[PDB]
Amino acid sequence: ARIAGINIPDHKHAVIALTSIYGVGKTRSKAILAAAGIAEDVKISELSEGQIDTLRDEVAKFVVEGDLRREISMSIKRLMDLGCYRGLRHRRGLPVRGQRTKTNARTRKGPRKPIKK
Amino acid sequence: GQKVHPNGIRLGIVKPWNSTWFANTKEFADNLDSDFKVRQYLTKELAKASVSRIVIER
Amino acid sequence: MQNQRIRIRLKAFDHRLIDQATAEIVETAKRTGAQVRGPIPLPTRKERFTVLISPHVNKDARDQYEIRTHLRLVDIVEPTEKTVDALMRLDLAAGVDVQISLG
Amino acid sequence: PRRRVIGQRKILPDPKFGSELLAKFVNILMVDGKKSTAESIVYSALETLAQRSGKSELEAFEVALENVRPTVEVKSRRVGGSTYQVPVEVRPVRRNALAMRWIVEAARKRGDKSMALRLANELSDAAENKGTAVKKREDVHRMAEANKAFAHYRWLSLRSFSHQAGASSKQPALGYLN
Amino acid sequence: AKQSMKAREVKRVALADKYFAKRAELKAIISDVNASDEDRWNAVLKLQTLPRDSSPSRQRNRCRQTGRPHGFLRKFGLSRIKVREAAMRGEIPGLKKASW
Amino acid sequence: PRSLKKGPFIDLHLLKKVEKAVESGDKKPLRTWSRRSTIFPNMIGLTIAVHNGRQHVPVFVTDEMVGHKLGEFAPTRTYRGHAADKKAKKK
Amino acid sequence: DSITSQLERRVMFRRAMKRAVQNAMRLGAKGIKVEVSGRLGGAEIARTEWYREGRVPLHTLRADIDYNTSEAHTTYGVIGVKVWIFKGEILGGMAAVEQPEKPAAQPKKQQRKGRK
Amino acid sequence: AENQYYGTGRRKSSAARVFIKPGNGKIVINQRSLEQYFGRETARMVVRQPLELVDMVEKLDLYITVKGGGISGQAGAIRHGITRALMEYDESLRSELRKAGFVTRDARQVERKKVGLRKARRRPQFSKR
RNA sequence: AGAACCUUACCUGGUCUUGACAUCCACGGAAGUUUUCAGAGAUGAGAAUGUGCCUUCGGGAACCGUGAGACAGGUGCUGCAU
RNA sequence: GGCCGGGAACUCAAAGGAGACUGCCAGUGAUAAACUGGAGGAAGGUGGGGAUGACGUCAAGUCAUCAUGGCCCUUACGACCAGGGCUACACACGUGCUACAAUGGCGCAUACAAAGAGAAGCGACCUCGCGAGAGCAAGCGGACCUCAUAAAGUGCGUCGUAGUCCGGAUUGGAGUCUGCAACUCGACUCCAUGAAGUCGGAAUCGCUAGUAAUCGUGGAUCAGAAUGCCACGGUGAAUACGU
RNA sequence: UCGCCCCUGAA
């Protein structure tokens, strides 16, 4: 159905299709489906009048989509307001790991190009 | 380098070892260090005879 | 299988030392015990290093080592009153491990 | 520089053809040194051919491949007396290799599901010369038969010809080609 | 490594013998190593922290006859260049070059 | 913090400070060399002057710095890009 | 060490080895190959004083290849010494004189008996 | 003592007892059939063929105890184990097994990694100009 | 041949000066043991406890601290001194 | 169930031998060496792989492994400690690794390894944990026991050529372990987020067979960190007219 | 045949 998340995609198995409604990744997909007895060997184009009911029911029990996507980034911004290493480095486009900034960190700073040394 | 000094099995089963001993699991290190230390003082304090070579058997 | 009751662990690095040792003592082992067990060779416990041959740089050439540590057994079976002989009194160390026990 | 004969490979008979020729057709369809995963596609595609075409099990490959192989391959070497790269009439063994290779290459120019279905349908169009793997033939063999200056390196060779009996036209070269 | 660098490590192994006893099990299983019995107290805190340099952490292994923590071979108490030298004369017994 | 084994480190160079900062409060921002300090909610709201090998610099600790080491909330190095500081930090 | 001690009394350098090799070849050895590093006369050049007499193959695996080093520590620098004496030539010292073991040539390999 | 006819099967880290029992029966390896010890594989079918080329099971019944080494390697030692137990009967057999290369031990087998090499003959690449 | 501190030579600060590490000389104390405070520790000052080996019973021997020099230490510089 | 007796035959181990030398057959080749086929044999023609890397040249590198001539520092440039920096960073280059997929991914079940390692250790068993792992504890300095469950592979379930069921970067939160303590600067795990990339120009490099390719495994260093080095096995080619 | 130069010094 419409559900708590966004509109259902079709032509894909239930486990599959659930990952494409975000705030739900690999595990969380099949985990919900398992619990409510929903089969994940059937598609959402093969969705039934049973499975559709528990669909909306179960997704309302967890923090997912926009709501989740808010909360998470509020804590990225929490640390930024603390003046933290982990904080400030995220507005310099820099990792917080043991990851090199010498050659690597071109996910952080995007594709390499000749620019000031 | 220019000479790489091939002697690593000329003193193997072609001529005898110059320090034949055995050591067990946690003795390896100990037996190694102790032997070599003695030889330094030994060779130094003897010079009134013409040393062919020290050897030890443990 | 068949099990032995006396086991002696003769252990040295070189086969040109371990088998000099074996031949001097498995001789005496004949008259020792009520049945002979000859010397089981066992698979070698082996070590082997690779250490850099140069004081500085390089990785093209490193010194290649081996060092097989052979483990012979002398062995007897059936304890007798003359087991004392070939065990400790006729087998002594010299840079070759000698087990003074029945294991 | 090359001393003595090349290696020869002794390979197993197929469990569905008995061949070493079509064992060499499993070999071309190997990737990552796995004969296991290779053998799959082979038989999967043999069946596809048998349905979509008439043929036989030794014509689903064989005949189809005898329409992809040229009898002349043009190799490379800078010398030619015109900076030419010479035609080389290929031995019957090397004929095989060319066509076999090209059919698998042709299935990496396709995206028509599996890999069996790809090379299968390709081989079905390759026996009447209406494929796209038979058009590879039409550049190697087209070139070679439309342009020749042979394996002679014209300036070097001509001097050799002259010495032997007096010629400027093509003959065996008595003198050096160095 | 130089004499002085060596010297440091000597003193650290001195302290090892005065802080591994009952003080060994204390630093290990009793007050560390997957929680504690009931502890994790201001007790634990003082006692563990002050002998900083009796730790095997604070000790970096190196040869006693040439030093250097790099190129070290713990198992036989050897290091880089001083393996080959000895071994050639047969002064390390049974050690020989690869021939397999 | 980056990680914790099961929980945080009270620290012995912080132990002395807490016990005398409930008897006299702050009296100068607390000169602490250790950056392994992690504080209670009873020790928040103070100017903990953690070192960085360069200077002891005060951090007016908050409740979100509880269960967190205080090293991460102070400059760990000196660096600059190719820009001035009045609208950005690179320290 | 004999010729090394000689250099440390500041007498002979080149000539050192030569005397000691007419000696060594007179009785004993089957060829010697000496190496000595030139540093003589207060000259500040790296040199190699290399003299052999008789045969020293370095790769013979059926001969007693001797090898030891010494070093002087003169005021002329450091002079390395290397003496390689080819004492054997067809006779080892651990490729000869040893006892192997097994082949004991008994067709029965003893076993425990009884049945249970 | 045995009651069998033996041929030694050493190939590629797989060493094999191979015991020919007189009379027709069925090949038995480790109390299983051939295609059950080597399963449902594609590879296994290919290496069945050289054992039927030297003729298996028409006057023969066996018991085999191969262990260690590879999957293909196991089958290899069997192949070099029945050939050594077939050359015994006649020397004309011997010749027509050596010309087939299957009583000839395939000495090819993994070569050591060596220093300065990435693999067993693979080495580092250059592009350092 | 794995750089969390140490490693580590580097920096900033604390701190020592025949010395952390050596021998010898002179003095005392056998070395140590468990604990206290301050400090970031380095340390600095204690509180109790130990009297082995020899002795002429002081003294020494290992060993510890301090003093004094001759010295010691230096991954400090020259691979165009070796 | 090699699980127990029995049997040492067999494999196996690993000490010692047998063997290969153009030795033998024919041709070719000065009747010489040798070369080409042949036979016997496991193997022919330096059998394959190691060790083997000369005398030298490069005043090549290395006073920082170590040694040492001269030079310099002497309430120090020496020495010791706490903190920080080595893992900065807007970039460039070198060497690797991982993908861009159905010869594949994911789910099920299933096939067989080798060689090393180990009482600052690995740890079966049983218990709990989604997991990493933790608790309980036998065994083991050992062809004992444990690491170890080999993985690609294979038989089935699916998905269908989509930047996706491919791919996995990034970050956050929640946890784990090893440590006195894991903040810059540890690794592992869990969940979420889900990247760039649809297979790479000019150019350039390796490789002639158990090699290439690819898939795992172990080891050292190591309290605790492998896409590295070093080593071990599995599966396993294409091509070579010719210089 | 495919043009194609340029390179401080004592060991």
Curated annotation (Swiss-Prot), chain B:
Name of encoding gene: rpsC
Function: Binds the lower part of the 30S subunit head. Binds mRNA in the 70S ribosome, positioning it for translation.
Species, as recorded: Escherichia coli (strain K12)
Subunit structure: Part of the 30S ribosomal subunit. Forms a tight complex with proteins uS10 and uS14. With proteins uS4 and uS5 encircles the mRNA as it enters the ribosome, which may play a role in mRNA helicase processivity. Some nascent polypeptide chains are able to cross-link to this protein in situ. In collided ribosomes contacts ribosome rescue factor SmrB.
Full protein name: Small ribosomal subunit protein uS3
Protein family membership: Belongs to the universal ribosomal protein uS3 family.
Entry superkingdom: Bacteria
Full protein segment contained here: 2 to 59 of 233
Swiss-Prot record, chain C:
Keyword rRNA processing: no
Entries under Pfam families matching the protein: Ribosomal_S10
Source superkingdom: Bacteria
UniProt cross-references to SUPFAM superfamilies, sorted A to Z: Ribosomal protein S10 (SSF54999)
Keywords: Ribonucleoprotein, Ribosomal protein, Ribosome biogenesis, RNA-binding, Transcription, Transcription antitermination, Transcription regulation
A biological process from GO: ribosome biogenesis
PROSITE patterns xref list: RIBOSOMAL_S10
Protein name: Small ribosomal subunit protein uS10
Species annotation: Escherichia coli (strain K12)
Curated annotation (Swiss-Prot), chain F:
Keywords: Ribonucleoprotein, Ribosomal protein, RNA-binding, rRNA-binding, tRNA-binding
MF annotations from Gene Ontology: rRNA binding; structural constituent of ribosome; tRNA binding
BP GO annotations: cytoplasmic translation; ribosomal small subunit assembly
Outcome following mutation: residue 82 to Y: In MW145; suppresses a rimM deletion
Family designation: Belongs to the universal ribosomal protein uS19 family.
Quaternary structure and partners: Part of the 30S ribosomal subunit. Binds S13 and L5 and cross-links to the A site tRNA.
Designated name of the protein: Small ribosomal subunit protein uS19
Gene: rpsS
Curated annotation (Swiss-Prot), chain H:
Listed GO biological process terms: cytoplasmic translation
Keywords: Ribonucleoprotein, Ribosomal protein, RNA-binding, tRNA-binding
Record bears the keyword RNA-binding: yes
Pfam families per record: Ribosomal_S9
InterPro entries (alphabetical): Ribosomal_Su5_D2-typ_SF, Ribosomal_uS9, Ribosomal_uS9_bac/plastid, Ribosomal_uS9_CS, Ribsml_uS5_D2-typ_fold_subgr
GO molecular function, one term: tRNA binding
GO cellular component terms listed in the entry, alphabetical order: cytoplasm; cytosol; cytosolic small ribosomal subunit
Record flagged with keyword Transit peptide: no
Similarity field: Belongs to the universal ribosomal protein uS9 family.
Subunit structure: Part of the 30S ribosomal subunit. Contacts 16S rRNA. Cross-links to the P site tRNA and weakly to the A site tRNA.
Functional description taken from the UniProt entry: The C-terminal tail plays a role in the affinity of the 30S P site for different tRNAs. Mutations that decrease this affinity are suppressed in the 70S ribosome.
Listed name of the protein: Small ribosomal subunit protein uS9
Gene source species: Escherichia coli (strain K12)
